[PDB]
Design a protein around this nucleic acid. Sequence first.
RNA 1: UGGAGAGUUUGAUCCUGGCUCAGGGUGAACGCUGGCGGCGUGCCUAAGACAUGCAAGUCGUGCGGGCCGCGGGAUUUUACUCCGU
Length: 150
Amino acid sequence: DFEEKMILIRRTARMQAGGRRFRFGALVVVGDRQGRVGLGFGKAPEVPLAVQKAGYYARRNMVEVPLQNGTIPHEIEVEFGASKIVLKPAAPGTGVIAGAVPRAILELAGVTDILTKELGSRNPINIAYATMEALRQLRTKADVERLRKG
RNA sequence: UGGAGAGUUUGAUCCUGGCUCAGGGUGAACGCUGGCGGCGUGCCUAAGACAUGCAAGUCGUGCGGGCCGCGGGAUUUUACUCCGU
Ligand SMILES: [Mg+2]
Ligand SMILES: [Mg+2]
Ligand SMILES: [Mg+2]
Ligand SMILES: [Mg+2]
Ligand SMILES: [Mg+2]
Ligand SMILES: [Mg+2]
């Protein structure tokens, strides 16, 4: 069992002959706070089945978060559409200084000291997606070494 | 040792994009309120106009006087004159 926080719920709507037709979208993170997180986007006729559905997709979509005591190996910037995130390593004592969206994601990978900036489009969905791509993109001294040995 | 963002264009969406808020600051002023103290601080406007008092003197160990005193002398005649203070 991982942890699970709901970042976002929204109600969307389509049109049909006489009246609009509502739907709900749910952004949910799940994490063991020990270097494993997942993002999930779940949509349904009702909030619950949606949230719940998110949960399910979150766990099916997971990342190696190579913590190095509270923080991440190095800096990364990732663009996702018009959304951009910068992630920066911090010495212990700082905290997760981030916006609600990536805070949630960082916290549940058990990151505790990180400096972030949201740049470009601040649309939650894409910020969240960038954050994940960013983490998914972190290497460590080891991995680099492996890559370059040959 | 250092970096958080949110609201608002649509029936809904993504994006551009402006407006707006959350923080910090001030020689402040204004409203309601107002107990004590220490340390700071107080014409940002007319370099407009200014009553009155005070804000730059001191040296008699550089010099000679004037005015008000006091005291000594010369003459034994009282006026005149010398010295000290
Ligand atoms: Mg771009
Ligand atoms: Mg923008
Ligand atoms: Mg409006
Ligand atoms: Mg329009
Ligand atoms: Mg509307
Ligand atoms: Mg905007």
